[PDB]
Amino acid sequence: MKAIPPKIWFETQLKGSGLDKKFQIDELIETQSSVRVFANKKYLPDTETINEALTKVTAVNVSGDKSGYFQNGLPFPNEAGYFEKIPVGHPELLSPIERLTGSKKIVSSHSLVTASGGYPLTNPLLPYRKPIRVSIFSLAGPSFENNYLHYRLFLLDSVQKIIDSPLFSHLHDGLPIQFDEAKKELGEYDTNKLMARIRLGFPYLARFSSGGFYPSFSKSNAIIFLSEAYFRYQLEDVSLLLASVNQTGKETGKAALLKATAVGMGFFAKIDCGYDIQHIIFPYYLRAYKKLLSEHKFPWIAKIEFPIFNEIQQEQFDSIFEDYDGPTKVYRSTRDVLEFREEEIEKYLPAAINPSDAFALTGNEWGYGSVESMIGNNSSIRFDQVHHMNPLILDPSHHVEAQINKDHGVELTVN
Secondary structure (H helix, E strand, C coil): CCCCCHHHHHHHHHHHHCHHHCCCHHHHHHHHHCCEEEEECCCCCCHHHHHHHHHCCECEECCCCCCEECCCCCECCCCCCCCCCCCCCCCCCCCHHHHHHHCCEEEEEEEEEEEECCCCCCCCCEEEEEEEEEEEEEECCCCCCCCCCCHHHHEECCCCCECCCHHHHHHHCCCCCEHHHHHHHHCCCCECCCCEECECCCCEEEECCCCCEEEECCCCCECEECHHHHHHHHHHHHHHHHHHHHHHHHHHCCCEEEECCCCCCHHHHEECCCEECHHHHHHHHHHHHHHHHHHCCCCCEEEEEEECCCHHHHHHHHHHHCCCCCCCEEEEECCCCCCCCHHHHHHCEEEEEEECCCCECCCCCCCCCCHHHHHHHHECHHHHCCCCCCHHHHCHHHEEEEEECCCCCEEEEEC
């Protein structure tokens, strides 16, 4: 086929899916006006970087496969390596390093929501009989699926034995960045206050210099996870989110009931698309929330609800928050992200995280294939957070610049 101009491809998809007929034109001018882009100024320092991060992306980036569609309609090549070799300055697509820095934003909108559920097959699609309004916070987490994104920040192996970018120097300051030095500072213990070999149950996850990942019993090639850097990274991401939710509630005069959807896990937490590391990184995610909620007050966040379905994550959550006594109420549930009771909707600002792909249009796939595509079919977010339909997201009056101090307090400046 032939390339379609991107705005027309997008409108075609809306008309072929039925989504254009689901919200009326007075309701969507309101929702589109609520869009905000909270950008960490350390990584997105000016308007041109922010708009680049919002537009220089693919249309669909499939969760399981390496499949997808560009914004002009054409499929991804089946050349391997194509995305790892995108250069800084490419006309249409973000560089790997630009995908790391581009993920340090959050796009929010007070969008309409017509149903809850739909993903996966066991989660039945339940309509709200009158549509409600949820403040939906889209953010991309660390991804370990391939080896040119966050894998290059938090792991040391035989192949890439040294960490790279100065834009992320600070995450590693005071900690090793070379594989052989790390093997020796660990000694023959497996853990340390700052690093840890990865155990897959009992054996090690290790990587041959040829390039392959294999389970091993030998420390010799066992890869090392830079846990203190990953924790510091989560601290920057969570503190940006809490500041933006808090600010959103402040400006609406209600306190938020925040659904803290799990962001980094699932397919993003499988090294080499095979070796699951959820059980290792999930506690550091929760400790970031614990530290920030114990040290800061968020007068406009009433409760945070963690949808947690796995037993290990369940007990991890219970152990990490047994001791938590900070002022924001915190609990876990098995409730769908977009499901609120009607007493919750009167009382609070309903608020939910959209676990987003930084390298695809908000909404991503068009079926019920993921938590994001679910939100994308149950809400107006494709109308509210895609620059094709809502150019206000490129307008600098809708950007909020954010500064994260050394104490992890966040300063928000409008323009």
